[PDB]
Amino acid sequence: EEERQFRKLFVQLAGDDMEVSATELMNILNKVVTRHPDLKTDGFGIDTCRSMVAVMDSDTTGKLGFEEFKYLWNNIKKWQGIYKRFDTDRSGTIGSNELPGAFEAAGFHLNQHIYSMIIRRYSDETGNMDFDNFISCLVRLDAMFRAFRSLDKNGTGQIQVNIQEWLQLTMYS
Amino acid sequence: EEERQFRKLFVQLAGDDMEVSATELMNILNKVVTRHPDLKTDGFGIDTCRSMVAVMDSDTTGKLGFEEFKYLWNNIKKWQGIYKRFDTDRSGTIGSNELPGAFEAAGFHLNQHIYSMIIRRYSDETGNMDFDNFISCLVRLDAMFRAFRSLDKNGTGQIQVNIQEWLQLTMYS
């Protein structure tokens, strides 16, 4: 299967340590997305890669575990398809007319106000967004929802944070 | 003076609106840092630029006001000097041996643990950090401290957040 292949690659990279670095992850992802007829991207940069590693690095190592990798991978794979589905005219961007649906499909019911900020932060002048930013925005959004949830537990929707917890959850992403 | 010059430029860009866009800001910053004999950088990318605009955009416009610009500008200017001071051998990176001081000098007394995460998130394989990341890391750190503080007020060091406030403070940066 697919994951069994990435396992081989993970073993070729870290062996038993089974932890990939940001640079190594970047190269793995770029072979797939950079060489895609429908994606229109230069591939993931190391900064994005470090974000990806940072948000998945549950046990503060600095690398990516294989299971963490799978969660991240199926996310990019899933969002990749949503990107292609909404970039129907193959222009290399998803428009302001399709983005709301792209986000709903990605797994996020965002409030108008929050949606508006996200768009302003990740869209270009025209209000359009490319594959790179789409994935970057979503990896962060998923990480921030996960960060919130880590401090929730009781399910109240209200959390208490001190500056150390704050910086830890926001800086390390 | 210096700021009076940027005012002229701001007027040449937005006139009375006096609000610069991320792309416009990127071009303004790159003329200065990209053409610097001691910096060793390709200049700020639009993503970094959007972050800069997002963290300063106090009244959710999507652009940068001139006063907001000044705060940001004096920060980059200040951090730029700290970068040069610590990249003494002019290699284009600040080492793991100088970074602690670079951060203290920049205005941050960071706890070992938080410092360690930051470094792992922004340093390269070697533990070294370049001008781009130094500024990127600091713009974010300052923004996160400002975000915390916006919800503090009583000065208790403990804040309460709901998911909307959470996403607003972390996504829009």
From Swiss-Prot, chains A, B:
GO molecular function: calcium ion binding; calcium-dependent cysteine-type endopeptidase activity; protein-containing complex binding
Assigned GO CC terms: calpain complex; cytoplasm; cytosol; membrane; plasma membrane
Chain positions with N6-acetyllysine modification: 84
Domain commentary: The contact of the 5th EF-hand domain from each monomer allows the formation of the homodimer and also appears to mediate the contact between the large catalytic subunit and small regulatory subunit for the formation of the heterodimer. EF-hand domains are paired. EF-hand 1 is paired with EF-hand 2 and EF-hand 3 is paired with EF-hand 4. The fifth EF-hand domain, left unpaired, does not bind the calcium but is responsible of the dimerization by EF-embrace. The first four EF-hand domains bind calcium, however it is not sure if the binding of EF-hand 4 to calcium is physiologically relevant.
Binding residue positions for Ca(2+) 1: 14, 17, 19, 24
A biological process term (GO) from this entry: proteolysis
Subcellular location: Cytoplasm; Cell membrane
Binding positions (Ca(2+) 3): 87, 89, 91, 93, 98
Chain residues that bind Ca(2+) 4: 42, 130
Designated name of the protein: Calpain small subunit 1
Alphabetized UniProt keyword annotations: Acetylation, Calcium, Cell membrane, Cytoplasm, Membrane, Metal-binding, Phosphoprotein, Repeat
Binding residues annotated for Ca(2+) 2, in chain numbering: 57, 59, 61, 63, 68
Assembly: Homodimer or heterodimer of a large (catalytic) and a small (regulatory) subunit. In presence of calcium, the heterodimer dissociates.
Function statement: Regulatory subunit of the calcium-regulated non-lysosomal thiol-protease which catalyzes limited proteolysis of substrates involved in cytoskeletal remodeling and signal transduction. Essential for embryonic development.
Gene that this sequence comes from: Capns1
Domain EF-hand: 1-35, 44-77, 74-109, 110-138, 139-173
Parent-record interval covered: 98 to 270 of 270
Coiled-coil stretches noted in the UniProt entry, renumbered to this chain: none
Predominant place of localization: cytoplasm
Top-rank taxon: Eukaryota
